[model samples]
Target: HHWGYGKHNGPEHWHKDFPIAKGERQSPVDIDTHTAKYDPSLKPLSVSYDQATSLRILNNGHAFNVEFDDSQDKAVLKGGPLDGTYRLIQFHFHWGSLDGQGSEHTVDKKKYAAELHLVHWNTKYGDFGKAVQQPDGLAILGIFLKVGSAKPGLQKVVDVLDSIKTKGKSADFTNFDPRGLLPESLDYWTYPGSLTTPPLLECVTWIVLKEPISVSSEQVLKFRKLNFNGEGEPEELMVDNWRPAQPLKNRQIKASFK
Candidate 1:
């Protein structure tokens, strides 16, 4: 089955294959701060990441992901809407083309240049597949990216794009620390959400950072250079590879800071 961002197989068509696409706890929801309440009981986030755990970067036809070796407890996410010490598995970015919003989760309906998702799986669950069925199986640390000052952290990911330009292509990427890509403040909003893509399982606890990191427009343009089509196929740019904000259901959105 071929699914893509084209007019035929985009997000709107995903419900045909993955019935949960329109479920209650969908993700990339618009975070309206006015409705978000401050929760004093919410704890701060604790992240322990090993720089050496980064393995490779792959263009998965949707968005490029920087995979990690999660065999050991090398890198994990704790605290902040989680009891499970989730192991960091992979991280990916959602971005736009030459213009418009690149971010998936909008702030007050405002968009940023891009959005980064640091995905992790709970250690309590024996396998990732089984974990996805549990309520608190996955955790995603979302960081917004605005076009401004250049960040060496983002540049490192961009530097490897040329080698993995086509779908299913991957290149070795080692010793890269994802912690460096985080925004200055850890203050965030937390909610129960699902994966923004297909097979949209309602298992992720989203910890979206309030502050956004900055990156150069030039760097984001490099992401546009990637092709959604695999090698030897027609050339199609991997831009606007993001899902629109889903409806916020009866669930509450809580803030870690006032």
Candidate 2:
């Protein structure tokens, strides 16, 4: 009944519980730009996020997620290979036990220190769970993280780590715009893929940004302090929660810019 990033229940063993883990369009593929095609037809991304919709931050065993109130179209993502508006449900991070070992998707076979996933579901599907069954039901915007100067926006999330250090713990978080975590460029590589987690549903239209945002070493280490266990249980550090890159197969990667 338990699924996690541990040796016994990690990414490699997820297929036993969810067969889609080995599906054709699995996610976290290595983005080799040289092999990616330039698609001028790809439109610029239109992201309109409402700071008021941010609800709270939670430690969900695997990672920390900043949940949003997706009841309305207040925070919606449009354009950029999308047919309709997608509501922002939540945003989370994937990190590693050591530096330079975390990111789920890589650029030219190179890994970053961490990565951020801004999860949104197609509004036409009504809800996230329902959308998971459709081909174009989800759009995940992935941003890579490198260790460098401190990222002011990330500090806001890091400051609240102490409040939600254990699994299932959450703290009130509001008026924060998730877009601040992004870099200067909106250029990205897109393709069809599945969720990087169990169920591994092939409903995602992957839009991975080319630019990487910076996070200080101290801020990166803060993520390691979180525990996968509840307050009264045996503590387990939460790290290396990212899944490895899967086969690109026959899928074509389209880039928004040259």
Candidate 3:
């Protein structure tokens, strides 16, 4: 949950070494397009980006958080274990400082160089952390990005990335709506399960969109320029920071199309 997961000293050690670290759900699954089932009704809520709802950037030193406010939007999914309309909280990235291999999601056992996670919460739950415990409490939109054909959709986001590259650096972005980063279609794969982090809260209704948003190879490389490891060491640069997939636990994933 606090990071630094690997073999030997990773999950295998935590279960025994740390009392509370035994059961966790690491992310970056090797999701296959063919093995997934599609769902149509389950789609991203339409979003509005404007100066009134400017993006608040948080510099956590290790990663960047792009947050928004959607407390008034009932467009959020409200049903079942989920009781309230969710709000657009924040979106962040986990990547490597290098190229060709930085992300965590894998397709057919093949891993992409990077991935982006847009995190949202169901306000119905009242509390964000608490909502993570229910099946429909949280909605995490997963997008896979590779170095290639430069997706114009991502240009909007990358435009801000360079502006906040240093540690503790914050920025206010006006008219920055997240939907601009969405792929060409709403087609996606859905599933009932827990969060990708520790406690591995089994409350998430994951919606992994099928189509990907691409970024040019140079732009992809720019992600590495942020000085992730720290301003000093230089050698121990933070490059690929993706967690591998967790157990499916016989969970049923549903996919819907246009």
Candidate 4:
């Protein structure tokens, strides 16, 4: 890898066996790991979402963690009931320090100002634990964010962020569901992968939507306000706290109705 992350002939050598190595759909695959066949006939499930019950916001000691209960909110991913079903779980985000960026997922080696992960678990096979073991267990929808004109919808969140603007500071958010942050559209890109966090299990089906929502420069700065570093701690500002892109280990990233 030119990035010096591998011991091979570098990323350039990947083109030998995989000519279109830079193709849109490639993943770092593990040997002996079996994925379901690329069944074009097996059709992807269509996602039709229901209004969330009630949104609960909590102070996770990291940042503002807004969560929702899935049992009360369900979505249809395909045309019929037989296609696929999923329930909403808690959704959180990644942020930089007071003056940096902290999103993990990258696109074409490009980093975003920030990123949001809408975590969902498959209900097709019944229960989150059982579904996670399957090939298509979890779906994490990704959305990019950039600093711009203040989004009217984001006003409520800004108020909450203001409350926790300092390190070692805690705040409480009430009467808010994280789903409201999602763009109105449901179109997305799907792929299989592991959780971004440690113990990164390879059980995620990612749906990275092309469109992004907007937040103001102020809001973006507020995200940077979240800090695990204790008061007077001496760690680097934690800007750029994102994980670099991983190998596209032979996985196919599929886009729907594009």
Q: In each prediction, how many residue pairs overlap at the backbone (N, C-alpha, C within less than 3 A)?
A: 0, 0, 20, 12
Candidate 3's residue-wise lDDT over 119-157, tens digit each? 768777786777776667787777777677886756666
lDDT value for model 1: 0.89
lDDT-wise, the better of 1 and 2 is: 2
The root-mean-square deviation over C-alpha atoms between each candidate and the true structure, in angstroms, is 1.1, 1.0, 4.0, 8.8
**2 against 4, candidate with superior TM-score:** 2
Whole-model Cα lDDT of every candidate shown, in order: 0.89, 0.91, 0.60, 0.54
Off-target runs (Cα >4 Å) in candidate 1 are: none
Decoy 2 TM-score against native: 0.97
Candidates 3 and 4 compared: the better one by lDDT is 3
Output the worst ten-in-a-row residue range by lDDT, candidate 3: 74-83
**Candidate 3: clashing residue pairs, number:** 20
Off by over 4 Å in 4: 1-50, 59-64, 74-83, 97-101, 124-130, 162-174, 177-179, 229-241
lDDT of 1 by residue, 1-258 (tens): 776778799888888998888899999899999999999998778888853399999999999999998877889999987896999889999998744587989989998888999999998996688889988999999999888888887778989999999989999999898978987799999999999988799999999999999888788889889999999999999998888898898789999999
Better of 1 and 3 by TM-score: 1
**Which candidate number would show the highest lDDT if scored against the true structure?**
2
